[PDB]
Design a protein around this ligand. Structure first.
Ligand SMILES: Nc1ncnc2c1ncn2[C@@H]1O[C@H](COP(=O)(O)OP(=O)(O)OP(O)(O)=S)[C@@H](O)[C@H]1O
Lengths: 144, 189
């Protein structure tokens, strides 16, 4: 036997670090197709959004998407239209669990605290435990 | 149970924060810890509808008045806030009949505040005082509140003096004045 660039290393790294796109999965039906269907099954209307996400996500497959840019969306629209429900359903698909989404409490922001609660502070300041919402999660969840 | 007294005065910025609290309970601490308070009850209060409750359109608030109040609410809070409210409730105007029932209750509370048995009413005048108080407190402009003032000003202030003057040991009585006053039981004893 041997170490295969793809089937062994790409997959090994993914098992170690996460990153589903490097698992070079055998099916974009049971990963992308079902995504559109199931997101559509639960989120009615906003089909346009579902496809926008699914396609942005599609581009990350095999690492095709830009190495320096997260899939990124801005959801505008009528409240009650699923602006955050879709996001949960996306996590619901991605991690097979809606609760794996990292919610960032942007509702509470002031330029004097707004960054610090996400990224924490430097030495010499009361409490280090940096990273409340972003650093502490992203360090452990590369494709959250 | 959380209670936010006079939410209309809260700056919209904090209400923005309340949006998390009010949906999924994901209110988080300053340090990034999630509280998870979905098991709680949240009650907020305001006076935004006062301009329409003051329309005096019935006891049970009538239609139109309720809608104008909703208008005031919509013109005050952002829709996203209002959308996270399980129920928006408009209180009723406290009618004379309500006032009579209220008087019964408030008088009972006075007895419940009586830590010692030298502060005790038999009261009497359960129709006369009840009627007096009910008429005098029947003012839309203050809801049930002036009753607290009526009781204090017509009954308790006088009681305080009677106590200071040792004109009462226990089991007090209110008498009708053409106004109200108290019975002298012992007299400077
Ligand atoms: N298209 C939809 N299909 C099925 N259920 C929906 C849909 N849109 C909304 N809902 C339901 O209504 C709510 C939508 O939630 P949200 O996406 O937060 O609404 P919202 O627009 O995010 O509210 P904000 O203030 O903009 S986050 C969810 O609790 C869903 O149950």
């Amino acid at each position: 036997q041997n170490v295969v660039d793809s089937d062994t290393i790409s997959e090994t790294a993914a098992r170690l670090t996460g990153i589903p796109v490097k698992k070079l999965s055998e099916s974009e039906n049971e990963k992308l197709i079902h995504m559109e269907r199931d997101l559509s099954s639960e989120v009615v209307g906003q089909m346009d959004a579902i496809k926008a996400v699914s396609n942005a996500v599609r581009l990350s497959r095999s690492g095709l998407a830009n190495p320096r840019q997260p899939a990124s969306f801005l959801f505008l629209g009528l409240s009650g239209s699923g602006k955050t429900e879709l996001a949960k359903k996306v996590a619901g698909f991605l991690f097979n669990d809606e609760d794996m989404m990292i919610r960032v409490d942007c509702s509470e922001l002031s330029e004097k605290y707004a960054v610090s609660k996400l990224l924490g502070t430097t030495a010499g300041y009361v409490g280090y435990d940096e990273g409340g919402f972003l650093t502490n999660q992203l360090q452990y969840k590369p494709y959250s | 149970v959380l209670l936010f007294d006079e939410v209309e005065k809260a700056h919209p910025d904090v209400l923005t924060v309340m949006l998390q609290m009010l949906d999924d309970g994901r209110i988080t601490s300053g340090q990034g810890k999630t509280i998870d308070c979905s098991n709680c009850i949240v009650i907020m209060t305001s006076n935004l509808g006062a301009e329409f409750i003051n329309s005096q359109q019935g006891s049970k608030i009538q239609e139109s008045t309720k809608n104008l109040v909703m208008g005031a609410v919509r013109q005050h809070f952002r829709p996203e806030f209002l959308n996270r409210i399980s129920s928006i409730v408009i209180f009723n105007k406290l009618s004379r009949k309500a006032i009579h029932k209220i008087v019964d209750i408030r008088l009972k509370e006075i007895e419940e505040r009586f830590e010692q048995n030298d502060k005790h009413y038999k009261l009497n005048l359960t129709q006369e005082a009840k009627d007096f108080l009910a008429k005098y407190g029947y003012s839309d402009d203050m809801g049930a509140r002036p009753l607290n003032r009526l009781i204090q000003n017509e009954i308790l202030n006088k009681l305080a003096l009677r106590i200071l003057k040792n004109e009462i040991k226990d089991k007090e009585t209110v008498n009708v004045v053409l106004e109200e006053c108290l019975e002298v039981l012992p007299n400077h004893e």
